[PDB]
Design an enzyme around this catalytic site. Structure first.
Site, short mmCIF file in Angstrom:
data_model
loop_
_atom_site.label_atom_id
_atom_site.label_comp_id
_atom_site.label_asym_id
_atom_site.label_seq_id
_atom_site.Cartn_x
_atom_site.Cartn_y
_atom_site.Cartn_z
N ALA A 29 0.82 -1.21 0.00
CA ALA A 29 0.00 0.00 0.00
C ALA A 29 0.86 1.27 0.00
O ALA A 29 0.46 2.29 -0.56
CB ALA A 29 -0.94 0.00 1.20
N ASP A 159 8.65 -3.02 9.16
CA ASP A 159 7.46 -2.22 9.49
C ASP A 159 6.31 -2.55 8.53
O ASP A 159 5.18 -2.73 8.98
CB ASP A 159 7.77 -0.71 9.52
CG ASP A 159 8.47 -0.21 8.26
OD1 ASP A 159 8.89 -1.03 7.41
OD2 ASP A 159 8.61 1.03 8.12
O1 LIG Z 1 14.71 -9.31 2.13
C1 LIG Z 1 14.16 -8.23 2.28
N1 LIG Z 1 14.79 -7.24 2.93
C2 LIG Z 1 14.24 -6.06 3.10
N2 LIG Z 1 13.00 -5.78 2.63
N3 LIG Z 1 12.44 -4.51 2.84
C3 LIG Z 1 11.23 -4.23 2.39
S1 LIG Z 1 10.52 -2.63 2.64
C4 LIG Z 1 11.91 -1.62 2.99
C5 LIG Z 1 12.01 -0.98 4.23
C6 LIG Z 1 13.10 -0.17 4.51
C7 LIG Z 1 14.10 -0.01 3.56
F1 LIG Z 1 15.17 0.77 3.82
C8 LIG Z 1 14.01 -0.64 2.34
C9 LIG Z 1 12.92 -1.45 2.05
F2 LIG Z 1 12.84 -2.06 0.84
C10 LIG Z 1 10.47 -5.20 1.69
C11 LIG Z 1 10.98 -6.44 1.47
C12 LIG Z 1 12.27 -6.75 1.95
C13 LIG Z 1 12.85 -8.02 1.76
C14 LIG Z 1 12.15 -9.11 1.04
C15 LIG Z 1 12.52 -9.43 -0.27
CL1 LIG Z 1 13.79 -8.56 -1.06
C16 LIG Z 1 11.87 -10.44 -0.95
C17 LIG Z 1 10.85 -11.15 -0.34
C18 LIG Z 1 10.47 -10.84 0.96
C19 LIG Z 1 11.12 -9.83 1.65
CL2 LIG Z 1 10.63 -9.45 3.28
#
Ligand SMILES: O=c1ncn2nc(Sc3ccc(F)cc3F)ccc2c1-c1c(Cl)cccc1Cl
Ligand SMILES: CCCCCCCCO[C@@H]1O[C@H](CO)[C@@H](O)[C@H](O)[C@H]1O
Length: 326
Positions: A29, A159
């Site tokens: 979102a 978050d």
């Molecule tokens: O591995 C991750 N590491 C960080 N994030 N952060 C975010 S949001 C976010 C928050 C703070 C940042 F500085 C930057 C942002 F992008 C979303 C996904 C994510 C992953 C991730 C990936 Cl790359 C694939 C599948 C599932 C997840 Cl949870």
């Protein structure tokens, strides 16, 4: 820094040349995320472009809230900022915000585990949560998609990742006076799912959710019912405890005990994160000298109702004042 501009899924991305090989990962979102190679460090990073940061007062405040929060988070099991940037040269043209963090590569939804895995994953959530709670922050929406995980099982709390099932019952009743242990309820639900390979409370709505909770935990005693103001909630609850030992038969009995101390209806009597870290279940991981707490966190802006330009200026100040980690 030299910026460059490209198009990924109809969304424009304008980032420093530092970041290379931008690969779309997903959206939510509140923005869209790419994977990228950080040429400065040689590590892979997640970059989030906030969608329309200053569309409205609420978007503006939400943007400020996120930037302020992630600037404060400095902990191994909690997402923090390696970098924050905007292509804007000035406040007058300020309309985009990008957040950068270390990439884990998966969330807990895309991951029936063994007991040692569960010990390590839940320990890391609780270690991160102790830090978060020590800054007087409540997450309020802990669920598998907000837990970023490595291929060697290292975990960070997000978050917003890429809900009712993991929500404390008082949130469902709309109590508005939530203890931090609303997050401990959520951890209890996640923990149970990892152990058993299935959702603990797969309710179809907020009402069915309470029914499912009550079936496992039992009807509240006299002491809890008298705290419920709502006549309707009391009438529904009264118009209806299972042996956890049997519900989770086959599991580590220390895992079952901890779960009983998390999935307690009375939020007063729920185990805290710091208390849970010292539970015998985490004996192999628990180190009280390496479970740090946070610097106090000023959330006083939350009670302010400001114009979009004020929120926007404050967000810009926080971008310009950002100092990266070592
Ligand atoms: O591995 C991750 N590491 C960080 N994030 N952060 C975010 S949001 C976010 C928050 C703070 C940042 F500085 C930057 C942002 F992008 C979303 C996904 C994510 C992953 C991730 C990936 Cl790359 C694939 C599948 C599932 C997840 Cl949870
Ligand atoms: C449908 C199942 C019944 C839900 C009962 C939830 C009891 C939650 O616990 C209550 O939380 C309140 C809000 O933090 C506190 O004010 C109360 O002290 C506490 O008892």
């Amino acid at each position: 820094p030299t910026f460059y501009r490209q198009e990924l899924n109809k969304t424009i991305w304008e980032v420093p040349e530092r970041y290379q090989n931008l690969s779309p990962v997903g959206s939510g979102a509140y923005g869209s995320v790419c994977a990228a190679f950080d040429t400065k460090t040689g590590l892979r990073v997640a970059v989030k472009k906030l969608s329309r940061p200053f569309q409205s007062i609420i978007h503006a405040k939400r943007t400020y809230r996120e930037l302020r929060l992630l600037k404060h988070m400095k902990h191994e099991n909690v997402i923090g900022l390696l970098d924050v940037f905007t292509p804007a040269r000035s406040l007058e043209e300020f309309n985009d915000v990008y957040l950068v963090t270390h990439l884990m590569g998966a969330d807990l939804n895309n991951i029936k585990l063994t007991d040692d895995h569960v010990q390590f994953l839940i320990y890391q959530i609780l270690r991160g949560l102790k830090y978060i709670h020590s800054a007087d922050i409540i997450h309020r929406d802990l669920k598998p998609s907000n837990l970023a995980v490595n291929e060697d099982c290292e975990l960070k709390i997000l978050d917003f990742g890429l809900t009712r099932w993991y929500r404390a019952p008082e949130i469902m009743l709309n109590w508005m006076h939530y203890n931090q242990t609303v997050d401990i309820w959520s951890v209890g639900c996640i923990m149970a799912e990892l152990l058993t390979g299935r959702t603990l409370f797969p309710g179809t709505d907020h009402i069915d959710q309470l029914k499912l909770i009550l079936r496992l935990v039992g009807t509240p005693g006299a002491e809890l019912l008298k705290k419920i103001s709502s006549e309707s909630a009391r009438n529904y609850i009264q118009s209806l405890k299972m042996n956890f030992a049997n519900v989770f038969i086959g599991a580590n009995p220390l895992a079952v005990d901890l779960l009983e101390k998390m999935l307690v209806l009375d939020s007063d009597k729920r185990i805290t994160a710091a208390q849970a870290l010292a539970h015998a279940y985490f004996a192999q991981y628990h180190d009280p000298d390496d479970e740090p707490v946070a610097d106090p966190y000023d959330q006083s802006f939350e009670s302010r109702d400001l114009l979009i330009d004020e929120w926007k200026s404050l967000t810009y100040d926080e971008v310009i004042s950002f100092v990266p980690p070592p």
